[PDB]
Design a protein around this ligand. Structure first.
Ligand code: K
Ligand code: K
Ligand code: K
Ligand code: MG
Ligand code: MG
Ligand code: MG
Ligand code: MG
Ligand code: MG
Ligand code: MG
Ligand code: MG
Ligand code: MG
Ligand code: MG
Ligand code: MG
Ligand code: MG
Ligand code: MG
Ligand code: MG
Ligand code: MG
Ligand code: MG
Ligand code: MG
Ligand code: MG
Ligand code: MG
Ligand code: MG
Ligand code: MG
Ligand code: MG
Ligand code: MG
Ligand code: MG
Ligand code: MG
Ligand code: MG
Ligand code: MG
Ligand code: MG
Ligand code: MG
Ligand code: MG
Ligand code: NA
Lengths: 50, 120, 160, 151
RNA sequence: AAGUUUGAAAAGCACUUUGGAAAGAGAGUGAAAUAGAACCUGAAGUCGUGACAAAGACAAUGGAAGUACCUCCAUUUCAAC
RNA sequence: GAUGUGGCCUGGAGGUUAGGACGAAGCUUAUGGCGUGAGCCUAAGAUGGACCGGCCUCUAGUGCAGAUCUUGGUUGGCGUAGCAAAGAUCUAACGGAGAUAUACUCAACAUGCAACGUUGGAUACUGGAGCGGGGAAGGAUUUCGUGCCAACGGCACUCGUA
RNA sequence: AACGUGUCGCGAUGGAUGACUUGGCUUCCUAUUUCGUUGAAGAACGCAGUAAAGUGCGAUAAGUGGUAUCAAUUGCAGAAAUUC
């Protein structure tokens, strides 16, 4: 599964570059479900994106 | 007066004819009984007319006209049909000059046309 | 008069390793530099384009025209020449065939057909009718689609 | 619609592909080597060519290609390992085997009796040369037809 | 640049099977499917394939005369001929 | 170079004779016959599917091997020259039809190779006169999401300014 | 041997030829035939249930009104005989 959208949204939300964003290598289905900024914020809260 | 000396002009007038000229061109002969009782030899076909195929594969087939397409120069008859590959039934088009009108769908305007046409 | 020449074609000259025929100028199309104006070029002008002041008509001496008509009339009286032309005059009573003037009084084509059958001119008419067919070649599309032989010529004293 | 007719139609299986998009010359070499083979031996050959332990002998389209020791089994000195043509021909052989099985024949008894590779209609691209020249950059697809007969 | 000129009529290939699909193999419509879609005919040139003829290097082609082998071709004979 | 030819051939027109769905023109030929020849005619198409032949005369945009001829197509060269500036990729997992794809003999190697996207790790480069952020000119939907891989991104693609 | 060379049969590529032409070119004729500030010709935008181009039309927009016709249009959908 491609997580380009989730990575870009996480970069914009966290205010850092793509190199600073960590998407869990697990939780790929959980991350790929997120398709909005609020969903990515929920993922960041849960710790699946750091 | 489509036919003329110039074949190019006659064909152009035929195949670019308007809808009403196409209606006149798509006439079918009346039956002998209808010729006897109306003194008219042919009439433009109409929806709900009863016709019988005289020429082609479907010769002898009798049915009621469901459509006078006038864009494909054909009339659709209910009894004339074939099945597709799916098995569904589709209407086979017939040129009106290959059929014969056995019963007329009569309206006041068509009655006036018949009175205009009759040779008596 | 403009049929092969509605282009701004110019020759490229020597040094370009192509033939010196004039070529269509400009670019962006398939005709760019495609050769032009020549009778040997695809879209070019024909050799010696035809004119309307060609001598279409002829003037014939009046005496020669009268001589020709007189000769044709004299030949129409010889049954051998009539047969050799292709007419069927086997049952014709006489050549030249002269009939009564009452045939002008006919008003129905049926009476004319009966007269033709009686005077035995019907064989040539049948020959013409059986000879009808579709013309071979381009004239089929040039308003001369049907051809047929020539039958008897009926001559009247007047226009009636 | 094949150029040749099988000896016994009920004992044969046919397979065809049009506009393959593999190179016509490489496919010509690859498919020609299995003409006359049993189906299983041809499939083993294609697998071993993919493994690079045997080569496809290049004849008639081997101009200035390299020499190899694996061409000796074919009586040649020049051969290659064209993988795109090999996988396309493997798919075609699978289709022929499926047709043979559906007809009711034994795929282990089939012998390839006919192979024909023909050039298809070409596809046009461009390359850009020095001094502002545009020059054709063409693709040469192929048609491949075959049938195999039970022995 | 370009005729959408399939067919009388879309009747424009249902369905089965292999294939990720494109397609293939069957089946079917049609008088015809090398009439399957910008599809009437379908040439030349070039190429593939099967069968056969052979053939050193005389570039090949070519002439003239034979012969070997072939020939879905043209004639003539088959009996007091 | 001149001239002659009941000399050959082509598209039309007057005539005249025929032919065609039991197959017309076109097309094909180890397919024969006739003619010194230009050519003509027959045969066969397991070709075609609707026109057309002979003869007399009239008429012309009437015959190709070459013009660095015109247009279209093809073609050997040739799977050849090459696709070498801007340092670079590796690894696991997941995804994908793209695999770990096998007739028998059979442990696996010696018979499915190679290639994709994403994420995590590793390694590197740009090195602030940046393959960083924003604008003008120019462009005008290339922006975004989903799907999608025929053609295009001169290798590849599951990726894409397609 | 293999490359390669022929010949024949069948395929492919390629679209010549022949048939067919709602086109062009040429000639001839007819007439209460000659645009516009009462805004022309040309440009540009838009309009259909579905509509890119083209055609037609102009916010009344693939047309309103009237007169003739006499039952369609047509890819699908929608609507459905005496002027209405
Ligand atoms: K009729
Ligand atoms: K050819
Ligand atoms: K010889
Ligand atoms: Mg009448
Ligand atoms: Mg011209
Ligand atoms: Mg002709
Ligand atoms: Mg080299
Ligand atoms: Mg080499
Ligand atoms: Mg270049
Ligand atoms: Mg440049
Ligand atoms: Mg053109
Ligand atoms: Mg049948
Ligand atoms: Mg055929
Ligand atoms: Mg064809
Ligand atoms: Mg001389
Ligand atoms: Mg001419
Ligand atoms: Mg030959
Ligand atoms: Mg000329
Ligand atoms: Mg020529
Ligand atoms: Mg080449
Ligand atoms: Mg190289
Ligand atoms: Mg390299
Ligand atoms: Mg280089
Ligand atoms: Mg480099
Ligand atoms: Mg692998
Ligand atoms: Mg570093
Ligand atoms: Mg550096
Ligand atoms: Mg550095
Ligand atoms: Mg910068
Ligand atoms: Mg590429
Ligand atoms: Mg529009
Ligand atoms: Mg208004
Ligand atoms: Na051949």
């Amino acid at each position: 599964v491609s997580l380009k959208l989730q990575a870009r949204l996480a970069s914009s939300i966290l205010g850092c570059g793509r190199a600073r964003v960590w998407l869990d290598p697990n939780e790929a289905v959980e991350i790929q479900n997120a398709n909005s900024r609020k969903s990515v914020r929920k993922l960041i809260k849960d710790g699946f994106i750091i | 007066s489509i036919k003329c000396g110039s074949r190019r002009k006659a064909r152009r007038a035929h195949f670019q004819a308007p809808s009403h000229v196409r209606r006149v061109l798509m006439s079918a002969p009346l039956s002998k009984e209808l010729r006897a009782k109306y003194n008219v030899r042919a009439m433009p076909v109409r929806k709900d007319d009863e016709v019988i195929v005289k020429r082609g594969t479907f010769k002898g087939r009798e049915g009621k006209v469901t459509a006078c397409y006038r864009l494909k120069w054909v009339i659709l008859i209910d009894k004339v049909n074939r099945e597709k590959a799916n098995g569904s039934t589709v209407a086979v088009g017939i040129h009106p000059s290959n059929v014969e009108i056995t019963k007329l769908k009569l309206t006041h305007h068509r009655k006036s046309i018949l009175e205009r046409k009759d040779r008596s | 008069r403009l049929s092969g020449m509605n282009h701004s074609a110019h020759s490229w000259g020597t040094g370009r390793a192509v033939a010196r025929i004039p070529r269509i100028s400009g670019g962006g199309t398939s005709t760019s530099g495609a050769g032009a104006f020549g009778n040997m070029c695809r879209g070019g002008r024909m050799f010696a384009p035809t004119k309307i002041f060609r001598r279409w008509h002829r003037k014939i001496n009046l005496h020669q025209k009268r001589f020709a008509v007189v000769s044709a009339l004299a030949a129409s009286s010889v049954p051998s020449l009539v047969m050799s032309r292709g007419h069927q005059i086997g049952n014709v009573p006489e050549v030249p065939l002269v009939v009564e003037d009452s045939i002008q009084g006919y008003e129905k084509t049926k009476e004319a057909m009966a007269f033709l059958k009686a005077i035995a001119a019907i064989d040539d008419v049948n020959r013409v009718n059986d000879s009808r067919e579709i013309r071979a070649g381009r004239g089929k599309m040039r308003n001369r689609r049907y051809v047929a032989r020539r039958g008897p010529m009926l001559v009247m004293p007047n226009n009636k | 619609h094949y150029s040749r007719k099988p000896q016994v139609s009920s004992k044969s299986a046919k397979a065809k592909v049009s506009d393959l998009r593999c190179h016509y010359k490489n496919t010509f070499e690859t498919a020609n080597v299995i003409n006359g083979m049993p189906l299983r031996k041809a499939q083993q050959l294609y697998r071993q060519v993919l493994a690079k332990t045997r080569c496809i002998p290049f004849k008639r389209y081997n101009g200035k290609i390299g020499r190899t020791a694996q061409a000796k089994e074919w009586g040649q000195t020049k051969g290659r390992w064209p993988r795109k043509s090999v996988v396309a021909m493997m798919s075609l052989l699978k289709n022929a085997e499926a047709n043979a099985i559906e007809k009711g024949l034994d795929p282990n008894q089939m012998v390839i009796k006919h192979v024909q590779v023909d050039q298809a209609a070409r596809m046009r691209r461009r390359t850009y040369r020095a001094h502002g020249r545009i020059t054709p950059y063409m693709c040469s697809p192929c048609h491949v037809q075959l049938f195999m007969s039970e022995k």
